[PDB]
């Protein structure tokens, strides 16, 4: 009944539409909020944050058998912490190069890497060693340690309504200790923030 590391499947009810089946791998259970799971779903590149046993859109949650197994560490270790250019191919067959940063080796799914993008600051997961060999990934050349860890603090901001909403600092990056993951209560994406000295 510990589901970290397990493949899972469940119904997902988007709005009032019919229940659809979802399949994914549970990467982690958030220490500062153990009802919060990070999930890598097949088909979504983005890591999801869900209270799997509390969220009302989730139904019939079951543990599945593990995925059929398969069989370079220096390349992966030099990639981590680094800024990168990641080349995606537009419908035109042309190339759009998103600048981003590689944050860590993903848990449970070791071939996979946590990555985030300047044009999209949420937490993605990709198998970057393939994209590097293919040439589609270039590694660019190269406060969070002064300040004590913010992990577990509950964040608070205002919307343009003046309505205040909350979130939670769930993780500090081991490779770049000024980078933090925030999961807001009203979204399932994991947003990446940098701790900056003011002015």
């Amino acid at each position: 009944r510990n589901i970290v590391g397990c493949r899972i499947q469940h119904g997902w009810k988007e709005g009032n539409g019919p229940v659809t089946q979802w399949k994914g791998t549970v990467l982690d259970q958030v220490p500062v909020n153990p009802s919060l799971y990070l999930i890598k779903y097949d088909g979504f590149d983005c890591v999801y944050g869900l209270e799997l046993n509390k969220d009302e859109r989730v139904s019939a949650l079951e543990v599945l058998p593990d995925r059929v197994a398969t069989s370079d560490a220096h390349l992966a270790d030099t990639m981590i912490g680094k800024a990168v250019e990641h080349m995606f191919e537009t419908e035109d067959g042309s190339k759009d190069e998103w600048r981003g940063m590689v944050l860590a080796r993903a848990p449970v799914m070791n071939t996979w890497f946590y990555i985030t993008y300047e044009k999209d600051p949420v937490l993605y997961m990709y198998q970057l060693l393939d994209d590097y060999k293919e040439g589609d990934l270039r590694i660019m050349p190269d406060p969070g340690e002064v300040v004590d860890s913010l992990v577990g603090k509950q964040v608070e901001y205002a919307k343009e309504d003046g309505s205040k909403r909350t979130g939670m600092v769930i993780h500090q990056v081991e490779a770049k200790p000024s980078v933090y993951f925030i999961k807001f209560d009203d979204d399932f994406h994991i947003y990446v923030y940098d701790l900056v000295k003011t002015s």
Partner: peptide, 26 residues
């Protein structure tokens, strides 16, 4: 959903002084 571009308030008011959390996109 639109994530705040900057965060500098905690509910217990303990956000460290002189710093801000900036969305990775700024």
């Amino acid at each position: 959903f639109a994530a705040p571009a900057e965060v500098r308030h905690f509910t217990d008011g303990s956000f460290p002084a002189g710093f801000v959390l900036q969305l990775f996109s700024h």
